[PDB]
Design a binder for these strands. Sequence first.
DNA 1: GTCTTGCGTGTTGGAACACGCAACAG
DNA 2: CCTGTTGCGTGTTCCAACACGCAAGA
Lengths: 140, 141, 140, 135
Amino acid sequence: PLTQLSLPPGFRFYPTDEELMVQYLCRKAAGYDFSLQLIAEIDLYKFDPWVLPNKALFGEKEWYFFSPRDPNRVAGSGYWKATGTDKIISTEGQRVGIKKALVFYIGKAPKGTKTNWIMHEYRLIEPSDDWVLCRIYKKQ
Amino acid sequence: PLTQLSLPPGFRFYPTDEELMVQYLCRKAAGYDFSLQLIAEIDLYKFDPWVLPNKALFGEKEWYFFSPRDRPNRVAGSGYWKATGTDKIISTEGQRVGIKKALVFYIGKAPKGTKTNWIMHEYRLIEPSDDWVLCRIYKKQ
Amino acid sequence: PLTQLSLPPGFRFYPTDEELMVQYLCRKAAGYDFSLQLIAEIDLYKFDPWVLPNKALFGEKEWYFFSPRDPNRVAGSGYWKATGTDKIISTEGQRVGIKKALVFYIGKAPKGTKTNWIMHEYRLIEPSDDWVLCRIYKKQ
Amino acid sequence: LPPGFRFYPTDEELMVQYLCRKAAGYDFSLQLIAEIDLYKFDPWVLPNKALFGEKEWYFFSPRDRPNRVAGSGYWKATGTDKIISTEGQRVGIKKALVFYIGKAPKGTKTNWIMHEYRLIEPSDDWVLCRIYKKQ
DNA sequence: GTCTTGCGTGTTGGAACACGCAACAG
DNA sequence: CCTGTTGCGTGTTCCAACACGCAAGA
């Protein structure tokens, strides 16, 4: 799924906080070729994250997915705990998205043990198909 | 100038230290050719850093170039580039192939020059005692 | 409070990272003359640091105090932000203390502006009278 | 000396408060910085000669009228001799040196340092030396 | 003098570790 | 209700590239 694009060495997918909101998250409901076809669809909360790399269409130390919009939602042998401060993403002065940090703890809150597996969950600002886009990676 | 590879949206150039040395410096170095000139030949030491972006074929905040190899604080334009840190080594599969040495542009006459936010990362090939170095260029903050 | 000791010119107070822990911080709970009597007691976090020199018993470009053991603790028109790496102090192989760096920013985190006023906060390693000893000086 | 107190005289003090007190040939209450011929010696024998000093010892030595041989080595000058001022008047230069062992320039470097403070003059004569070992 | 690589420690601001305000259930 | 239980932000300190600039020899 990589060299359908025929990429030269050194090139990587380094999307902005801004691109992810506008070009990916927003465009999927609309049906875009490169958008329908370039990122794997999955319910992230059914699995332990260390299973995910083999199920991701690509990635070397980071992976991206679309997952159903929703607390300490259970996944595998653990739970996701919000960390840091949600940040607002703007393009040309409009709020289009929110970047949210999470940390995976194994076990059951608040008796869980922290792990190094991390998520960044990006969402659009809007009232009541409807997905969030998530980045996964491993610390240190 | 990139647009002969129908760029996917979102894609940017973040080659590893290991790739630049080997996939770039060597491809050019065995003197083998590239499909396209992506990293252009230039004499970087004839120039002001602020004129350089105009010379890069692409790059938004970084531009990379190849420049002819020296056979220290080489004067270039209005300044001098000052070396920094400990030159660091690039390895591939347990073999050493290159050193990236960082520099900063000072304007003026050494050592009475003044510091800038301009950085160079210069990648070079290893050898025993058609000769190029590879330079990453960018401006801080 | 200086020439009770009758000092010859050229002499200054240049305590080691090690002396401050052992001879000063540790000895005060014990009631030592030169220790009760040589360093001013103050709650550092009620004041802006540029007020402190007149309230310090001595110092020319540096000042030292004992202050109550405790985040972005407000002081005056600002906040103290941890900087660098906490360092461990040992004497003859025992950890007796920690040296901690801080920088004063004016305003309210994380919208503060950095100033050149600096602190080194030294503390003993022990569960929960109980003070930290702090050095103050000015960059540049 | 009370506990905690150590000798960290400024560049400006050493020149004036020390070198001059001795230099107008005026006396001191106590000899704190002793007279010695430093260039007769190995740096590692020197601490034994300092009347105090834990990591630094300072001494006074008779004055020259370059890489002066001393003991098993030679001292090599470094940096740009730096100037000491007091109240906008220049009074002295501190020049740093390092001890090399052997025969110049085939000698070998050490961790031994000298800072030599000296008095200014026009075209009973001493220099003042700070001694210490690095790292 | 002139002009350098090669080590040192400041300054930054990034993002994770652990405490309670705020809410759902029991 | 009025508490018991089950999540979620938000202010700290950590951890670390990156070079800054004396300073040394080249």
